[PDB]
Amino acid sequence: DDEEETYRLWKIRKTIMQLCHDRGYLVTQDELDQTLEEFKAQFKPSEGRPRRTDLTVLVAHNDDPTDQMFVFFPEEPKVGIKTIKVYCQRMQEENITRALIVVQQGMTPSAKQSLVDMAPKYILEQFLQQELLINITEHELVPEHVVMTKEEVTELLARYKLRENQLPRIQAGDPVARYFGIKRGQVVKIIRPSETAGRYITYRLVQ
């Protein structure tokens, strides 16, 4: 239905804008605080304008402006190979290398192979529409996750005389790992409150 659909797409827009903010990509405050009625005014979509191509947005890194990212919305139910090729040609046109794509309710297994095989030159991530309906990072159970630069990881391993394999692990397919878009080899500093020390900082290796 049109009403729930516009509410859903506004909520997904909010979630991905918060995600891009968390990944260090520059997003203004108003789009982070975009009301539902502001979504109504800026764009009701029942083939009025659910042009999912129009909801796609580009964002740039706070400290690395040439490092930019697209987010795409395919309007077909299960994404096909040829629209992945269209998006990759778009990225070639704009030189973008990172672009995470949402999907309506699923993704074709052929596309599952077609994203991983072209991964090392073009980073792409597939998100179910259901997942981005809520920002999981605001849940009370998830603690604060922050990615560590390699300088910080070297400092950490030098402090504790540790090797990377000795740290506890986190799977790359974890929801928060996919939220931050962290590849294998990254290290996440998790800051959580504790009832014995007040604050506790642990470190998880992406493997």
């Binding site: 129009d54 402006p65 040609q89 046109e93």
Partner: protein, 550 residues
């Protein structure tokens, strides 16, 4: 005090001068200028005994009672029956204007003049004539003089227009290049936040006569300068009226909707299908009889940020036609983009002489230029793919850096083709397609109207040129733009020479030694630019001495 039948200091000294009983005369003056309540004439000695003079409780009640008088000026503006309340305020005006000279009743009368739509203009004339009143006058007082006569409006917009051009010139000539930011980053609403245009909106408020006055001033200065700055200030003033939600201009101006659409267009720097359809239906509402605003409408389109928007939109349409496997004839939004840009560039000519017509696009511009541009991109991406394939062939397919002379002919004879080619060069510079960059750069030696030497494009090309900073060490990459392109029109306009000198001032550490030496001694002030090139050449010489230590 004499204006309402009360004495002054000279009358006091008369009452003292040549008197056998000066003390009783002083007491009589004190009685005749006290506060007339019967409890005070006994309490005045008693409170005087405390060490508190009579004037002190007078000061306290003075502050209290004029606070209430100003409160009631606002109230009678908003309270009472209309004829009685305006009669009360006008009568109180006649009472109070005798003391606007005094330091008490200026702002009270200024509020009274604020809340009356019209006044006898003697007091407005005194308000403009006196500098103190010219400052402290409320905004509607100033409006009423402007609405009754344009002298003060011109007198105060002339320095403000001058300051706007000062800001434009200073920002366009600034010597910073980065991957982080440029000076065209602020949106038009970002640039409206300066107090110049917001104050101009306050000066106009919600009045249509002052709107026409600013329109005619910007029209005259735009017709003499041939500069887009006054067009941009019209657009900023209209959208600042909309920022206040000024219904007196926004609902009646046929251009307000269209400029509001263009605001989002410039904010994204593209004309997307939604706002494209909006602006296209807005254009298709142009019919014979009511085309008088076409001049103003296209005058809005002249903004540098709007030129950037339309030009990058045309480049994006060119580039997306490549992947679609479609001819340029099948691009309606592209034709809309070029129609709007042609209208905007012809805006000034419309101000000079009103010519209402939807222009037609040149044949070879649509049938020959754009397919060649698409072919350039196709060759670029074929070369890229052949590089990326495993073992294509020995010395893989050389991307054509050739110039099909039709391309240069359209770069140098067909205005629209010139500008879209300029921004095409800019966009490939952002993507650093060097072979395409030196494919399309040569042939710019001849240009229509030196649009390739305008402040906008030269600023942006400088802004891109720090990406390939090390190539300035090579003589050819700089010489293709400096010895080949800038010096073809460096001594013709001040902006070109200034642009080259700021580019070399920023990027002095990386340019080769003899190369920068020859650049300075060749781009020395040639005799067609004033203090700007003097200060830039002073910096050039000082940083060349710095380079001699490099």
């Amino acid at each position: 005090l004499q204006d309402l039948g009360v004495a002054n200091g000279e009358d006091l000294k008369e009452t003292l001068t040549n008197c056998t009983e000066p003390l009783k005369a002083i007491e009589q003056f004190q009685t005749e200028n006290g506060v007339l309540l019967p409890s005070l004439q006994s309490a005045l000695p008693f409170l005087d005994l405390h060490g508190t003079p009579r004037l002190e409780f007078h000061q306290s009640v003075f502050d209290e009672l004029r606070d209430k008088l100003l409160e009631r000026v606002s109230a009678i503006a908003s309270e009472g029956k209309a004829e009685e309340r305006y009669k009360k305020l006008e009568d109180l005006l006649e009472k109070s204007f005798s003391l606007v000279k005094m330091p008490s009743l200026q702002p009270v009368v200024m509020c009274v003049m604020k809340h009356l739509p019209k006044v006898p203009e003697k007091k407005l004339k005194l308000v403009m004539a006196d500098k103190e009143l010219y400052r402290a006058c409320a905004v509607e007082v100033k409006r009423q003089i402007w609405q009754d006569n344009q002298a003060l409006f011109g007198d105060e917009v002339s320095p403000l227009l001058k300051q706007y051009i000062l800001e434009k010139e200073s920002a366009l000539f600034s010597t910073e290049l980065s991957v982080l930011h440029n000076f065209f980053s602020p949106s038009p609403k970002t640039r409206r936040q300066g107090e110049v245009v917001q104050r101009l909106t306050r000066m106009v408020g919600k009045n249509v006569k002052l709107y026409d006055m600013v329109l005619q001033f910007l029209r005259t200065l735009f017709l003499r300068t041939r500069n887009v700055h006054y067009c941009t200030l019209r657009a900023e003033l209209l959208m600042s009226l909309h920022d206040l939600d000024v219904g007196e201009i926004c609902t009646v101006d046929p251009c307000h909707k269209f400029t509001w659409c263009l605001d989002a267009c410039i904010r994204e720097r593209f004309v997307d299908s939604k706002r494209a359809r909006e602006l296209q239906g807005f254009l298709d509402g142009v019919k014979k009889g009511q085309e008088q605003v076409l001049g103003d409408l296209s005058m809005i389109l002249c903004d540098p940020f709007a030129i950037n928007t339309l030009a990058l939109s045309t480049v994006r349409h060119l580039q997306e036609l490549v992947g679609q496997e479609t001819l340029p004839r099948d691009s309606p939004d592209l034709l809309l983009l070029l129609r709007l840009l042609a209208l905007g560039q012809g805006a000034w000519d419309m101000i000079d002489s009103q010519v209402f017509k939807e222009p037609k696009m040149e044949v070879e511009l649509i049938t020959r230029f754009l397919p060649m541009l698409m072919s350039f991109l196709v060759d670029d991406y074929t070369f890229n793919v052949d590089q990326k394939l495993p073992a294509e062939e020995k010395a893989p397919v050389s991307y054509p850096n050739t110039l099909p002379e039709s391309f240069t002919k359209f770069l140098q004879e067909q205005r629209m083709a010139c500008e879209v080619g300029l921004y095409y060069v800019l966009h490939i510079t952002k993507q650093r397609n060097k072979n395409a960059l030196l494919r399309l750069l040569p042939g710019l030696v001849e240009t229509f109207g030196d649009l390739a030497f305008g402040d906008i494009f030269l600023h942006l090309l400088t802004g891109n040129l720090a990406l390939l900073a090390d190539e300035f060490a090579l003589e050819d990459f700089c010489s293709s733009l400096f010895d080949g392109f800038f010096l073809t029109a460096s001594p013709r306009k001040e902006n070109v020479h200034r642009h080259a000198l700021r580019l070399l001032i920023h990027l002095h550490p990386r340019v080769a030694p003899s190369k920068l030496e020859a650049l300075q001694k060749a781009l020395e002030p040639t005799g067609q630019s004033g203090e700007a090139v003097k200060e830039l050449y002073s910096q050039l010489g000082e940083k060349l001495e710095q380079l001699d230590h490099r």
